[PDB]
Design an enzyme around this catalytic site. Structure first.
Site, PDB file in Angstrom:
ATOM      1  N   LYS A   1      -0.712   4.978   4.358  1.00  0.00           N
ATOM      2  CA  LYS A   1      -1.601   4.080   5.088  1.00  0.00           C
ATOM      3  C   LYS A   1      -1.114   3.818   6.540  1.00  0.00           C
ATOM      4  O   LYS A   1       0.007   3.351   6.775  1.00  0.00           O
ATOM      5  CB  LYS A   1      -1.771   2.760   4.348  1.00  0.00           C
ATOM      6  CG  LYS A   1      -2.705   1.791   5.020  1.00  0.00           C
ATOM      7  CD  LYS A   1      -3.193   0.754   4.044  1.00  0.00           C
ATOM      8  CE  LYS A   1      -4.183  -0.172   4.700  1.00  0.00           C
ATOM      9  NZ  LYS A   1      -5.402   0.539   5.179  1.00  0.00           N
TER      10      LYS A   1
ATOM     11  N   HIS B   1       0.811  -1.202   0.000  1.00  0.00           N
ATOM     12  CA  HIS B   1       0.000   0.000   0.000  1.00  0.00           C
ATOM     13  C   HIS B   1       0.842   1.247   0.000  1.00  0.00           C
ATOM     14  O   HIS B   1       2.018   1.203   0.288  1.00  0.00           O
ATOM     15  CB  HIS B   1      -0.911   0.025   1.208  1.00  0.00           C
ATOM     16  CG  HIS B   1      -2.130  -0.821   1.067  1.00  0.00           C
ATOM     17  ND1 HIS B   1      -2.167  -2.142   1.442  1.00  0.00           N
ATOM     18  CD2 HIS B   1      -3.367  -0.524   0.617  1.00  0.00           C
ATOM     19  CE1 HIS B   1      -3.371  -2.626   1.218  1.00  0.00           C
ATOM     20  NE2 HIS B   1      -4.118  -1.664   0.721  1.00  0.00           N
TER      21      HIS B   1
END
Ligand SMILES: NC(=O)c1ccc[n+]([C@@H]2O[C@H](COP(=O)([O-])OP(=O)(O)OC[C@H]3O[C@@H](n4cnc5c(N)ncnc54)[C@H](O)[C@@H]3O)[C@@H](O)[C@H]2O)c1
Ligand SMILES: NC(=O)c1ccc[n+]([C@@H]2O[C@H](COP(=O)([O-])OP(=O)(O)OC[C@H]3O[C@@H](n4cnc5c(N)ncnc54)[C@H](O)[C@@H]3O)[C@@H](O)[C@H]2O)c1
Ligand SMILES: NC(=O)c1ccc[n+]([C@@H]2O[C@H](COP(=O)([O-])OP(=O)(O)OC[C@H]3O[C@@H](n4cnc5c(N)ncnc54)[C@H](O)[C@@H]3O)[C@@H](O)[C@H]2O)c1
Ligand SMILES: O=C(O)c1cccc(C(=O)O)n1
Ligand SMILES: O=C(O)c1cccc(C(=O)O)n1
Ligand SMILES: O=C(O)c1cccc(C(=O)O)n1
Lengths: 267, 266, 260, 266
Positions: C152, C148
């Site tokens: 995040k 990600h």
């Protein structure tokens, strides 16, 4: 300040190029073109983009607007780009070419015009790819002689040429660093009974699907181990920003054939 | 004079391959082999271990008992065992090729010390490709490291006891070093729960342990809008074994010091 | 022809939901809301219809609310749905245990779609993971890998956790009994039953997830890649279309997609 | 107990098949063949395997040893396999086919003989691949209609056919679950100006390099997301063990065209 004409402004790259050139404060969007038959001729470059209104209209021919711009950024079709290249020669302009899918003879023609016109040309305007070309050269010097070399690329459903210009470029860098010519070794299709792989071939495989912006992988495979060097682009703006940078660099540069390696200082 | 090799931990995954590799190299002789004192395979012929006829050598519970039969130890065992063999090398003027990983920071220093007096080859990976990779990582880090997020991902077989791999750490060291940093300042080895936003400078490590994977490593350099990945995959252990035996051959009658595969190859 | 109200239309998801609903030819963007103090209020969804400060003002114009906002705001829209006989697609996340119960209660009277991921791919992948786990799970090492973007805050992802839950569940286990979230230093040999999680955080990656099932000599990998958040929007709009003129109840994407 | 003849015993698969059949305790290595011209005719199957000795020699023709075995395991070449298939019909013997690269008319011939002979045939004898076929069906039912479908495979340098049999099988399973015929939609090569991709096509890409044992990936790509199902084989023994399990299952079965789905029950 550099005044940029965006060829093919309604295109995927065109739209991104307009956005990128606009947002670069050392550059102005001065002009934009489309196919003469196109629905979007006569429209304001802000409007097609939808982002407010600039004082510029999409032209059906860049010759009509030659006094408004210094540099063409061209990510179109080979025929259209050769026209714009001619236009540059006739009226003392510069051109950044991102178009791919040229034949061998068309390329030579570009080298010719590049003696008289300042030309940037590259199959990929991202920084990563340019680094990858350098990495491939080093891999090929060390492993190429003893390894099978394969190139794999994936792009979105709309891409018309195969393999990608970048894939070919990768092969060229590899072949060149080993003292070979890509056309001597390249294998572009494997179908039916191909027999055993030759030692020297560079195989190409091509995936076309969805909206993939672009993945490339060069594999160097020995017996017992393998090395893979991969680039993934996720946003077209990566290219567009690099092209606009190239245009800025190219402005007031003596005529010649320049690559992104030159623009970036990566040789 | 051919190099006479002692294979530490000869019944191991690497040990069995190292015996096979050394045997098959015609500039090397399998002279000795060791196992854990408690081991089921002590007293057994090294050929019976591989199936390849019978050599005239038995698996010893201690290499000190066979110190006159060999010049170089090839050690792919455990950190403690390897420190023992290192001491043995110092006491009796022998050389050692170390393939063992999972040393602590202090243990490694110890190794650098003994390496002033003993000829020592040490590397986290004895394959040629990984070595090319370290060089490639240095060129990538110089160009992209400053503005990119750097992540290393590695996968190995279920039995591997240490994490991340020695090779992954080496990849980190090469990257950090080419950027003028120390890996321990930037490395992040685990991400669990609420980590907050990634820092700019960190080098993250992710680790997969599954099946019989011989070894995959990937270094990723990620920007906004593009990313570059450099990957190595090993598919046969013999790759490592062959490289280790090549290191042993090279190391024979070398002066004392700390050598790497970069030195063995060039 | 479903008439959709997009709660929180200036948001990351709200903007994508408007685009997605517009694009879908069996759906009409009928309405949109923002925070009362919000700048967007009064503005056309064009940036026909204006962003309202309160969806109650526009109830006649819509059948289904798509809500990817804040738990408090979504409970308000849920109440609105109950009062005026509307439906709601909930994409909001972070609800407390009590709040979810409240949702369960309203869902007896209101037609409600709720799911922690609306991408169609991921939902298919959960079904594929169940089948792989039934066939290979017992004798294979199971590992989950996710990547990600740099911003995040949580690890591993919620989706990664979901993949582990689907796998553990299809094998009759509880994920917290088997999960291993970090491997550092000398871990010793892997256990037979563990499900390992590895986490990558880099760049602008929207989201990659891979579940691996590894044996000796072969391995099976099932992978999902999101490239635009439009994938979640398109799936939510697909849920809104499906939910229209459904009877009241608690529905999930599994129901919308017909995965049973 | 099943008595196995290994066609093409000196081959990559043949060598693994001998090893696998030997090590399966419900199976005996009874016979083995090779090309008549072959250097390894007359040699003991144990010598070939490098594991001891067996009282059996590599024959130039399996007809010479028919009384000896019940089941042929054939991972050779299409022509050789059609011969062994004829041999089975003539002498009432069952066969496991692993060979790939048959033409459309040859595969029709095989279905014909399979009315009279018990035949197992599959492009892949690994468990993972078969599960993958099932997974691909579920993915195609849900995503196939609106997604671009692409198959990518990689294999070692020596593989003579492209794309792999397993890749075609993946395409067949996908096309079948969507109610289509693979030959209507398959695109096997992309070269020069192809124009825009069609909506229905299933593209195949093929990589040939090194000693890769076999990677296959089916990709289902939408706008904004994509789903990939991937299989990797790392050891040929995976195939060999599965082929031998097929041979054991096939013994004293009635004549029919069977697949690995039948052998395994999924
Ligand atoms: N080197 C790189 O960095 C790079 C990056 C992206 C794309 N490309 C390449 O650039 C080309 C364009 O890619 P795309 O996806 O944006 O293509 P596209 O089909 O979306 O757009 C091409 C545009 O050029 C226009 N055009 C065609 N002929 C024209 C003419 N005679 N006059 C004016 N306009 C004309 C078309 O109408 C279209 O809008 C392709 O060859 C692609 O491979 C290169
Ligand atoms: N650098 C590389 O190329 C490379 C390659 C493979 C493995 N390794 C590393 O080498 C090590 C071994 O991997 P492996 O699969 O071979 O391990 P393994 O567990 O299969 O075998 C190691 C062997 O060492 C033996 N041993 C332990 N202590 C001993 C002692 N005191 N005396 C004699 N024998 C002893 C054990 O009994 C065992 O048989 C690990 O640290 C691994 O990470 C490095
Ligand atoms: N279904 C599967 O799981 C699977 C797995 C691996 C390979 N294969 C297939 O098996 C085939 C061969 O595989 P390989 O990689 O081992 O090939 P290979 O060339 O290494 O071996 C084939 C062998 O068959 C022998 N042969 C040929 N003609 C013969 C004859 N008339 N009589 C006796 N022997 C003969 C050859 O001499 C050779 O040794 C290929 O078509 C391949 O795709 C299938
Ligand atoms: O190298 C190429 O051919 C290339 C590079 C970037 C984008 C594209 C494309 O989208 O067609 N093609
Ligand atoms: O770098 C490492 O740590 C490493 C390298 C090769 C093999 C192994 C292993 O098999 O354990 N570990
Ligand atoms: O699908 C196939 O054709 C296949 C499957 C496994 C191995 C091989 C091979 O090694 O040739 N080929």
């Amino acid at each position: 300040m550099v005044r940029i004409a965006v060829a093919g402004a309604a295109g995927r790259m065109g739209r991104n190029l307009v956005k990128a050139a606009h947002h670069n404060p050392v550059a102005k969007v001065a002009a934009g073109s489309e196919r003469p038959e196109s629905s979007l001729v006569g429209v304001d470059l802000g409007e097609l983009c939808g982002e407010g209104k600039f004082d510029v209209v999409v032209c059906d021919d860049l010759a009509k607007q030659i006094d408004q711009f210094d540099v063409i950024i061209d990510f179109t079709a080979p025929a259209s780009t050769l026209n714009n290249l001619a236009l540059c020669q006739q009226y003392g302009k510069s051109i950044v070419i991102g178009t791919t899918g040229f034949t061998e003879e068309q390329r030579e023609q570009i080298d010719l015009v590049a003696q008289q016109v300042p030309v940037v040309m590259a199959p990929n305007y991202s920084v990563g790819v340019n680094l990858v070309f350098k990495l491939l050269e080093k891999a090929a010097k060390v492993m190429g002689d003893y390894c099978d070399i394969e190139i794999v690329e994936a792009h979105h459903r709309h891409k018309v040429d195969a393999p990608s210009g970048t894939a070919i470029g990768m092969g060229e860098a590899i072949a060149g660093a080993m003292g070979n010519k890509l056309s001597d070794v390249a294998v572009y299709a494997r179908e039916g009974i191909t027999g055993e792989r030759t030692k020297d071939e560079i195989g190409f495989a091509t995936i076309r699907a969805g909206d993939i912006v672009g993945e490339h992988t060069a594999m160097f495979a020995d017996i017992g181990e393998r090395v893979e060097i991969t680039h993934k682009a996720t946003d077209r703006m990566t290219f567009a920003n690099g092209a606009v940078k190239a245009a800025v660099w190219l402005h007031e540069k003596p005529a010649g054939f320049y690559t992104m390696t030159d623009v970036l200082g990566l040789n």
